[PDB]
Design a protein around this ligand. Structure first.
Ligand SMILES: CC(C)CCC[C@@H](C)[C@H]1CC[C@H]2[C@@H]3CC=C4C[C@@H](OC(=O)CCC(=O)O)CC[C@]4(C)[C@H]3CC[C@]12C
Ligand SMILES: CC(C)CCC[C@@H](C)[C@H]1CC[C@H]2[C@@H]3CC=C4C[C@@H](OC(=O)CCC(=O)O)CC[C@]4(C)[C@H]3CC[C@]12C
Ligand SMILES: CC(C)CCC[C@@H](C)[C@H]1CC[C@H]2[C@@H]3CC=C4C[C@@H](OC(=O)CCC(=O)O)CC[C@]4(C)[C@H]3CC[C@]12C
Ligand SMILES: CC(C)CCC[C@@H](C)[C@H]1CC[C@H]2[C@@H]3CC=C4C[C@@H](OC(=O)CCC(=O)O)CC[C@]4(C)[C@H]3CC[C@]12C
Ligand SMILES: CC(C)CCC[C@@H](C)[C@H]1CC[C@H]2[C@@H]3CC=C4C[C@@H](OC(=O)CCC(=O)O)CC[C@]4(C)[C@H]3CC[C@]12C
Ligand SMILES: CC(C)CCC[C@@H](C)[C@H]1CC[C@H]2[C@@H]3CC=C4C[C@@H](OC(=O)CCC(=O)O)CC[C@]4(C)[C@H]3CC[C@]12C
Ligand SMILES: CC(C)CCC[C@@H](C)[C@H]1CC[C@H]2[C@@H]3CC=C4C[C@@H](OC(=O)CCC(=O)O)CC[C@]4(C)[C@H]3CC[C@]12C
Ligand SMILES: CC(C)CCC[C@@H](C)[C@H]1CC[C@H]2[C@@H]3CC=C4C[C@@H](OC(=O)CCC(=O)O)CC[C@]4(C)[C@H]3CC[C@]12C
Ligand SMILES: C[C@H](NC(=O)N1CCc2cccnc2[C@H]1c1ccc(C(F)(F)F)cc1)C(F)(F)F
Ligand SMILES: C[C@H](NC(=O)N1CCc2cccnc2[C@H]1c1ccc(C(F)(F)F)cc1)C(F)(F)F
Lengths: 565, 103, 52
């Protein structure tokens, strides 16, 4: 029956006294895996594993190859069924297994793995359909499971995988951006409780900040601290550490600015030394983060920007020390200012967890295409008008700087406010001409004929009018309309997207050493010196879930027909 | 505003030693750039001087640059792009986003 | 000078054809297509503006 794809007969055999454990324990499994496998499925699995690879891909491929050449019985039949897109044979295997939410999530990711290939349209669409199907099952199962016992559900969510795929349930969910599962209340509440720490989740959301500044005020129980002893628990809370780090960063920024512009001399003074120490600590933490991750740490942009800031700062340090040359000091100051520009903008990034304005910050990423389209059109128009005007007015210039200054810069300046050029009108002119190129002024207008301007007025002025009409107001209004549509359309998805990012940051901050920033150095120096029941409950909840499915199916209320008969 | 103002003031006029003028240059003019006029005409070097004050006695901005044997020292190929990008981002993009959100 | 003027106008005509030839990018071409449907609004605005 298994060979011939008879799902109903398989169910009838299993439920009617058949023992699947003993049957699977036989060597038939090996046989069932050595021969039964479809050849194309094997080839596609191998090519997919080789091309992409992953924590789970290699595990299942290796187990399958081991069986083909010559524990975890049901986890093999499940993957067998799911590879061949067998809808009616995979569900039974899923039901039989233990810890089925985990298996469902893994199967959803695995099905989504191969959807992209364009070799066959239907072969991809059908697999994507099943991939979408499994996610709803997993989500509904977990939602039903959590509604009964919070503690047991939270315990279930952190079960240490016994090499199902080498990852936890939550890890598998986050692997493939199934934002719906995480966004669901349960995991969100778990993350909130994890983030806050000992402090209660009803502290009024502002009393703790007030107490942070006033250390002695901790004594009085203004905050519902219950979930001296406090002073080692309060300062270990990641929330407080984050707020204190933000305050320290702002203070460092103020000091950096003051040193940069108010007080800068040939020989550094004490504030420069303090600033050097602080940047050194930041660099040490950066190397720590470099170590704990590999080369995927460079995948995103903000880390690259931080690295660039540090490198620019050290380059400036190198430059400024040559007190003999006065020019090198100016060059170093310039480098410092650019590094400051890079440093400052990171504040917007670090302020994505406020929950009062962060969801708005998230949506900025989706508006880049409109900007690029507007820039394309604007650049084309600018080039056209500038080239035409410069060509018709001032003959030959023989100077790259001035030609680039006239062709592009002024028409660009026409975008906001002022007219692109007053040269077009001839009523006023001269007193700025330079027949020779010695002086630093634009080449004289026209090739004036016996001392009179030669260019006409009946083409230049209409050119300016049309160019300004098109560029200044039409394009900008189109831009605002496109922005309005884009902001309107993507609103509902925004919250879920932001919650996903919230999880990604919460785990990152919880994992850190959780030490207030100034004293972290000591930690690294000391480190250098030093160097079952839950599954049963899940099965019960599954029984209830399946009964609920059956009741929903039977709710058609069509038994009156058979009663009539 | 803070980013651009600090960078420009730091790269141009060396040390000012006067809180009023430093606050006037760092914040007020870049803010004035929000509606209409360009944040600063100092960035372009074709026109300058006649408003400098080497000493702090007079009530005018500190003189541009640490001019080397009587010539402005700052380059033009970083200041102008800075102004262009800052004005592009602040003046029109942010305002249009504001109107979209209001709508 | 007259010939140079003619050349500049011809250059203006030549340049704008780039936008037309860039309608197959699939990254921004669908946007370019929609520009054709916005002419009536422009004409209405111009009518009122001219009268005033
Ligand atoms: C000149 C210096 C020394 C003082 C400047 C004051 C700032 C450092 C203080 C003023 C108000 C503070 C903020 C008050 C509220 C919040 C939101 C808070 O974000 C959350 O944790 C929200 C979590 C949730 O909503 O679930 C982080 C700290 C922050 C930015 C606080 C951190 C530091 C701020 C910006
Ligand atoms: C030469 C001098 C003028 C440089 C000044 C340094 C600035 C970069 C610092 C000084 C005060 C800082 C501000 C202090 C307080 C706030 C409010 C803060 O908004 C919130 O706290 C949101 C909290 C929430 O709603 O959840 C955002 C940053 C801001 C403007 C800080 C950003 C950076 C500022 C402007
Ligand atoms: C960045 C985008 C979104 C806005 C459009 C950018 C242009 C307006 C910028 C980009 C590069 C700039 C040019 C880079 C270098 C120079 C040379 C500079 O003159 C010098 O060479 C000074 C030194 C010398 O005289 O040798 C005058 C400005 C100009 C044309 C800059 C003016 C404006 C340009 C074209
Ligand atoms: C004597 C004066 C006008 C100086 C010469 C300059 C003209 C040759 C330029 C100025 C504005 C340009 C126009 C700007 C807008 C348009 C609409 C555009 O319409 C379309 O072909 C697209 C719409 C569609 O496909 O239906 C064609 C070019 C045209 C007339 C451009 C072609 C050349 C014009 C008339
Ligand atoms: C209110 C928000 C929404 C808009 C941004 C505000 C800034 C543009 C304002 C806030 C405080 C103002 C400053 C408050 C005090 C002074 C000193 C003043 O000079 C004096 O001290 C006159 C008296 C003397 O010379 O002693 C020049 C303006 C300045 C920097 C003001 C200019 C503009 C500032 C920075
Ligand atoms: C030689 C000139 C350019 C003077 C030096 C100034 C530059 C270092 C400044 C001017 C404008 C800044 C840029 C303004 C906008 C952006 C896009 C921004 O994109 C993102 O990372 C967010 C989008 C996403 O996450 O996908 C990154 C910084 C960048 C390049 C800024 C970084 C630094 C820039 C290039
Ligand atoms: C100064 C000169 C010598 C070099 C300037 C560089 C351009 C000539 C190059 C840079 C990037 C290139 C573009 C990269 C991507 C595309 C999209 C491509 O459009 C498609 O075929 C998309 C089809 C689809 O999406 O299904 C056409 C070529 C184009 C415009 C390429 C053609 C030439 C471009 C504009
Ligand atoms: C006197 C000099 C300054 C004249 C310069 C001639 C310009 C008409 C050329 C020079 C470089 C060209 C640009 C090179 C690269 C691009 C990007 C290109 O956009 C894409 O490649 C889209 C591809 C995609 O997303 O699918 C659009 C044209 C543009 C601005 C080209 C349009 C025409 C430009 C500005
Ligand atoms: C950059 C962004 N900060 C901003 O302020 N803006 C301004 C408003 C806005 C609106 C829609 C999309 N993007 C932005 C964004 C912006 C995008 C591009 C440019 C460029 F043109 F210079 F490339 C400048 C600014 C942050 F630093 F946070 F990443
Ligand atoms: C012309 C168009 N290029 C553009 O850039 N625009 C600018 C923006 C825009 C917005 C809505 C509708 N049309 C346009 C279009 C435009 C339309 C009319 C005029 C006129 F008033 F001069 F007649 C100038 C420009 C291209 F060359 F590609 F055909």
């Amino acid at each position: 029956a298994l060979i011939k794809d008879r799902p109903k007969f398989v169910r009838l055999f299993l439920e009617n006294g058949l023992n699947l454990q003993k049957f699977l324990t036989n060597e038939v499994l090996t046989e069932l895996f050595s021969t039964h496998f479809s050849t194309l499925v094997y080839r596609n699995l191998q090519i997919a594993k080789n091309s992409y690879n992953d924590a789970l891909l290699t595990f299942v491929w290796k187990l399958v190859a081991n069986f083909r050449r010559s524990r975890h019985p049901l986890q093999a039949l499940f993957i067998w069924a799911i590879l061949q897109n067998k809808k009616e044979l995979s569900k039974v295997i899923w039901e039989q297994t233990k810890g089925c939410t985990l298996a469902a999530l893994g199967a959803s990711k695995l099905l989504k793995t191969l959807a992209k290939v364009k070799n066959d349209i239907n072969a991809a669409g059908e697999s994507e359909e099943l991939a979408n199907e499994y996610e709803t099952r997993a989500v509904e199962l977990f939602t039903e499971c959590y509604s009964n016992d919070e503690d047991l559900a939270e315990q279930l969510l952190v079960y240490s995988c016994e090499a199902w795929g080498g990852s936890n349930c939550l890890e598998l969910a986050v692997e493939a951006t199934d934002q719906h599962f995480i966004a669901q209340p349960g995991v969100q509440n778990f993350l909130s409780k994890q983030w806050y720490g000992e402090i209660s989740r009803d502290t009024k959301n502002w009393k703790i900040i007030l107490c942070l500044f006033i250390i002695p005020l901790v004594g009085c129980g203004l905050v519902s601290f219950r979930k001296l002893w406090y002073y080692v628990a309060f300062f270990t809370s990641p929330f407080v550490v984050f707020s204190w780090n933000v305050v320290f960063y702002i203070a460092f920024l103020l000091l950096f600015a003051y040193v940069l512009l108010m007080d800068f001399h040939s020989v550094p003074h004490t504030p420069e030394l303090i600033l050097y120490a602080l940047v050194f600590v930041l660099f040490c933490d950066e190397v720590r983060q470099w170590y704990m991750n590999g080369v995927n740490y460079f995948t995103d942009l903000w880390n690259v920007m931080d690295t660039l800031g540090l490198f620019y700062f050290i380059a400036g340090i190198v430059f400024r020390l040559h007190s003999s040359n006065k020019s090198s000091l100016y060059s170093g100051r310039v480098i410092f200012c650019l590094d400051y520009i890079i440093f400052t903008l990171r504040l917007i990034h670090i302020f994505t967890v406020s929950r009062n304005l962060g969801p708005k910050i998230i949506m900025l990423q989706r508006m880049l295409i409109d900007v690029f389209f507007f820039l394309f059109l604007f650049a084309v128009w600018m080039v056209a008008f500038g080239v035409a005007r410069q060509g018709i007015l001032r003959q030959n210039e023989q100077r790259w700087r001035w030609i680039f200054r006239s062709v592009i810069y002024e028409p660009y300046l026409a975008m906001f406010g002022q007219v692109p050029s007053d040269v077009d009108s001839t009523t006023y002119d001269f007193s700025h001409c330079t027949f020779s190129g010695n002086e630093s002024k634009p080449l004289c207008v026209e090739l004036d004929e016996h001392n009179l301007p030669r260019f006409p007025e009946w083409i230049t002025i209409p050119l300016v009018c049309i160019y300004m009409l098109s560029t200044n107001i039409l394009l900008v209004n189109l831009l605002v309309a496109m922005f309005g549509y884009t902001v309107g359309i993507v609103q509902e998805n925004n919250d879920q997207v932001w919650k996903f990012q919230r999880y990604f940051l919460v785990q990152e901050y919880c994992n850190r050493l959780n030490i207030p920033f100034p004293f972290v150095v000591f930690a690294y120096f000391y480190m250098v010196v030093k160097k079952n029941e839950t599954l049963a409950w899940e099965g019960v909840m599954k029984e209830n879930y399946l009964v609920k499915i059956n009741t929903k199916a039977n709710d058609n209320s069509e038994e009156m027909r058979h009663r009539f008969r």
